Structure prediction request, 1690 residues.
Amino acid sequence: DRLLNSSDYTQASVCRECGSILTTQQSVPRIGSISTVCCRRCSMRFEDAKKLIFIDDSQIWEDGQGNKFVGGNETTTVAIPFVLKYLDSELSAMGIRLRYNVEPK
Amino acid sequence: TTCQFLTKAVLDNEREQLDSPSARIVVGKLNNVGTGSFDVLAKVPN
Amino acid sequence: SAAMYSRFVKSALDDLDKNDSTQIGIIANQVALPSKNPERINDKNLNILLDILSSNINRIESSRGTFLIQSIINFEKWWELPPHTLSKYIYFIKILCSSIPKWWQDVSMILVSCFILPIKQTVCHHDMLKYFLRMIPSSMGFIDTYLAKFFPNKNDTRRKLVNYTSNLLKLRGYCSELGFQIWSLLIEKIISIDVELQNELGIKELSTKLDSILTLVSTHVEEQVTPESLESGEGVGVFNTLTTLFKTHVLPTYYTRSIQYIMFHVSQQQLELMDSFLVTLIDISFAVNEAAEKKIKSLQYLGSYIARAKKLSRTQIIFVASYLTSWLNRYVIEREEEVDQRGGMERFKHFYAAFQALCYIFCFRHNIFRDTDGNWECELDKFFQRMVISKFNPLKFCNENVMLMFARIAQQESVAYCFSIIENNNNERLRSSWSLATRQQFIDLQSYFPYDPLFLKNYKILMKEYYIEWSEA
Amino acid sequence: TFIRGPICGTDNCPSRLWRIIDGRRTCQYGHVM
Amino acid sequence: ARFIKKHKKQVTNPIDEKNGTSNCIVRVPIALYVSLAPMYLENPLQGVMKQHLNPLVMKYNNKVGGVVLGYEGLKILDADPLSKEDTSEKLIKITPDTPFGFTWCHVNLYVWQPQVGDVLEGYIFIQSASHIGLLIHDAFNASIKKNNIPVDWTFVHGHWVDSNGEPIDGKLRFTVRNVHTTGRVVSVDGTLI
Amino acid sequence: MDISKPVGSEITSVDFGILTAKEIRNLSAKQITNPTVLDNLGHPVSGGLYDLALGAFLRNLCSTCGLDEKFCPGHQGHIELPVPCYNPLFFNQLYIYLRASCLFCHHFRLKSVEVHRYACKLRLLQYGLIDESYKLDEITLSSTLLNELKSKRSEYVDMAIAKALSDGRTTERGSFTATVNDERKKLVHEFHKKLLSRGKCDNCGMFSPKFRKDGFTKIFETALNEKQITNNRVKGFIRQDSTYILSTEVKNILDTVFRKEQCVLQYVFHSRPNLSRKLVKADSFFMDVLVVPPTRFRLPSKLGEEVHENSQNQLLSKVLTTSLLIRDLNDDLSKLQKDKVSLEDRRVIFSRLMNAFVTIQNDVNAFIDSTKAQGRTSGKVPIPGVKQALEKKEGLFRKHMMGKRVNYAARSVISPDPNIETNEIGVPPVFAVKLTYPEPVTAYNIAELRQAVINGPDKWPGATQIQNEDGSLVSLIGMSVEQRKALANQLLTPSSNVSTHTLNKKVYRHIKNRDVVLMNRQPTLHKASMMGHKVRVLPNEKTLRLHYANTGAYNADFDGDEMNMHF
Amino acid sequence: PEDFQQHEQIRRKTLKEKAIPKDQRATTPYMTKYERARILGTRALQISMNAPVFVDLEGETDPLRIAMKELAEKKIPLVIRRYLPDGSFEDWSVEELIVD
Amino acid sequence: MYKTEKVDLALNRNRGDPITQHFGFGNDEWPKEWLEKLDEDGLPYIGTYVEEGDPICAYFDDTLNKTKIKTYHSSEPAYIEEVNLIGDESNKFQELQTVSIKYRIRRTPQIGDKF
Amino acid sequence: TATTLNTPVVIHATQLPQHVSTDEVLQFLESFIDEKETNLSSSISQLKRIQRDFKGLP
Ligand SMILES: [Zn+2]
Ligand SMILES: [Zn+2]
Ligand SMILES: [Zn+2]
Ligand SMILES: [Zn+2]
Prediction:
């Protein structure tokens, strides 16, 4: 409760695939479509993906700038203390990567 | 000495198995001591 | 102009196959302007742009084409366009959502939001909803949520509220499958109606609001439910979903004054509708599984209903009396022995609850229970006395004002003499025990009568044909 | 208690936000978000 | 050396006889990890049905790669690995933080999975100069864009006309170009060349 | 934390590792290149440190997700370092391998046979096979014999691991206990000692020039000594079939050594079996990019009314300027032929390059690290770098995990009371009216909670708000009695929404005598200085009242000492 | 895909072999003070969210008290899974454990 | 207990700068409940009871074209004792910019007070 | 929208999909429709339309 609940309890997105909590974002959808949760690490820039079978519609997402991506849809949410995000962030400044193994796969 | 032990962990490509009280507090996991030392299951009929 | 513009666009489209996209955007921006700005594309040119786009919609189904399309879906007050031009806009939308179902999501949202507009001004919106619900039945999902999203707030203008229900009723009449969800939405507004009126019993506002809304709902239902419509129709459907929403919303919350009169009123359209309601009430008030408070609320409903509902037949009433005395006679025969045993008189809430209802029913309808001979149906003379002198001592535990009125009337009719038992009761009081932590909710529950007179001007008048005022009884 | 700003996060207003120190922020009909 | 390419349409849907279309209805067994609300503790199968399975019916589902038509043979996997698959008393582990359970389930899904390349038949319901609108199995939307219709086909005010000057009607046979799945309802992009 | 928002996914382990410049570039939301942070109208400079792709900032919406300062999680970007830098974390280890290298045959100067003996042992230890790693040393039966020795040791390790896997003793994930970890650490130490202990290369017989360092991560190369240059050309025929040295030279040397000595490194750098099968690369010791953390972790501060820049931004912009400046040196450098072109400029270009490398390397050091930075303007005292922020004062662990500022709860002077139970605590109404449990509404408590909501925020026992099934809160604060009576009558209405159908409303009530709180007096030196007491609300009191029987536990004196009440 | 299924079956099987035969159980037949508290709290939580209740409430409004009552009559449909330190486990039903 | 607070709206101004804020009321529309605590000069009437959130000061801000208000911050209510106008030297001409307000707080001796 | 209350945490096919004959599609539709007799209502309505087509009708 204190660490749990007072402390900085936070439901956060992880990529089940790369195990990060820092490389997810909400997609920005066309009007009428619904936003989804995606991993910037695990997905290809749309161009590069074409340059290597047909690509399904549910597999493309876009950001605010406008770039299109393929893949990176293996996300969920986990409950972590917020300060974990800060630590992970600082560590990546130092070139260090934390990789959280999430279950179920 | 946080950065020293961290440097050591990285160079070992260590996995934190998350069993110690400290580690579980770090990741927000229920402690391994106590009322947490067993699981509860419900007996359901039908 | 006329043909110059035909060129301008025809060029724009060529230029779009080349990706320059400027010409189009110039056009789009021109159509996107507000209904007010004089510089918004005029009818004649719009007639042209539209008929050209409709003729080969595939030319536009591209990322470059998106903005143009978005700008036409978002054309302000399109329903306000002149006949001929309006027609071209409609045909375009029709064409668009057929070759590209994706845009139906955007078009319908705007449509639903227009439900705040009067019936006369929506024909085109419904025409379009009817069309695409049929051809894209899968849409019913998100478009249902729109029904939720865009419901006017209680604070918002009455004309907005009254309109947005008028349309929902209209919608119901061509997309049945949404029918339940609709009725659930209106009812759940339900809660706002419960809000309006009880507490007050600004306030002048909610009165005429809630009054305009109910009178509408019930007249639409009077039309939806009819014998013709009951055998081969969706009358059945409406009654069902309104009865369900009565059991899930009206009864429990169960201090509403707005709202239970929807059931009071539809009920009395046809003999069986009444039958179904009575037996439904009876069910809820004597079911073994249900919580006691539910059973007590139903019993209040039951008693209030029989008393008030003008269109009831002598025999449906005797039916309820015959159920209650029967159920009561059994209670006393099987249970009186439990009183001098360990526990309190609360163990018998349910007994008093039913005996109240029956007493109450006798107040309003005693003149009916005398058969041709001058004898009493259900041996009420002999029956009441037996309960009154029982060990439960109903007179002490039921609502005080009813027990008093029953005394008065019963004594007058040579049916029963309670007045000495009452004397004894409030004497023993000054000088059969029940906590009072929980004893009050019961006194509270026994004070509420869901069909005591209405105070909404119009509704009242409308109910008169279906209501017995105390003065009448 | 007024600040007018931030309309109301309830689409049957928008009615009109005052913040209490406890951070509920309250709109007149009585949403606290 | 790296395979995300295991999201490549492998339908394969077979061509039929006595007929010419592709059969796209398929039966796939799945496992699914779901929550069980406390209100359903005496009716766990009922609860899995009302919470998770029922909402899947007649919607596209990204994992089976089609529209789910329905389901058969729901089974809960007992958290007690020592019990017989028989018994009607099972264990479902409760969340530490909440009263909700989470269990694995096995069920069978019936799925309409039109992949690209397949041959389908549709009932024509709309004809503009921009597209032909069809309804497959009288249920799912299809659309043939203006320039997937062969070049010598002409239009009038309206309704289409084919290579030999005769109008088209009712049943039409087309091949799958792409399947759009992200909208409110599924929609098929079809071609005639 | 809300009992009606369960989480299905669960983190089960964490793996430590190194971000590659390829990953970073791919995940990055924006490359940052402008030292300048704001413009004249206080908007983020594009391509600067507050660039809106890195997250919402002040009023503005995030350009990557479109979310506001509240719902936008932030996104990382990167700076492109125009020239490789040593990662200051790892420079000592880099130093060890660099020194150990033979700049001629590109193996470690330690004889291959020995290095293989270490690789065998460490590999065995990945599987926890301690006895076997000693038995490995028991193996003996000039370059023909050695390869058979290497070979038979190798077939022993395989046979041992196979055997260990077949019976219980290990999995493919390894086995890792303290005794194993101890043996592993010794070996790696022994191995490193033996690496640096060699002069002449045991494998090709040559001498490599010796490497020397700074405390500021610069590497010098001392040219060859006389006897050693003589020794080297004698071996000249067999091979036929001081100065600053740039980080790029160092990386090339290690790149090749890491290819050749890959086998041993595969176990020196993995305490567990490396299932991932990734090569161990020299790049891991260097940075070609820097991850710019999201804007929400680099916000300005307000010291009362005045606003101060974020110190991590001050450091990053110094990286940015040096970066632009080097990209210019690199531009003029290419506009040589000097196919024509007179030599000496060669010396000046080098002078400018050394300057750039040194000062960027200093700024990195200072951050990981102000320690690795040259003391500024003798005075001022250093500004903390990232390392010092994580390690500074008492540290994240002690200041925000062991101990925390807390939210719900109260504090008061305690007063004695013989008239409450020894297991109760006398709670003043001033508390009782402000503290709520979030009570879920049910059939069994609908009477109670109705009354609380009617009573309102200010009449105890009442309530301050209602949580609806869609999570939204409704304040009871501004409300009349009638509005409250209305809300109280809809506490238990059915669900008009399938998604929230499993939930019930919650009433944020005032606490009452049925309740339990946690009482605390500091210092809390044993668990009895934090116990659970039953609540007893007492009219007219302004302090917490506590039975004497509890002074012992809490070490309480009633001399104006205070206690905390946690709900 | 076929073999992940196999992998799961192996995981789950070995977990049960930890989680063990009923007739080979070896821990205390008494409910521990810890098991009791958690059983009460958790069952109370389920009661607060409309779990079917196996006993007469008799006016009780505290879900913890309802749980206690259920415990007293041994009508709590919960099972304790006790973990030995190697991760293998014994399942014990609340009704079968001796409570004190 | 007595507490003295200094309200000095020359705190921002960059040295002998043009004066933006002057004690008093503007002619725009402002609460009016304000005059319960504050006299015409924008200073509080002596003797006034003042609890958390009340006005203790009113000035007109030029850069805002609005009349603003310094509020009382203690959670303990008090009464106004002295209000001193601290004029400036450097020869007159300058208008009022600095004020000292002294609050009086009642202490009937409470639980927890030491004797 | 989607929560842990209405959406599986994860779904996995355990086998390759097996194609089904028309006679099977019909036998399944039959029973599934019967067993399930607002979103579900409008859905069995659609299934009813599909089973109609598989029998050849309008
Ligand atoms: Zn990822
Ligand atoms: Zn609002
Ligand atoms: Zn963002
Ligand atoms: Zn060598």
In short: The longest helix of chain I spans residues 39-53.
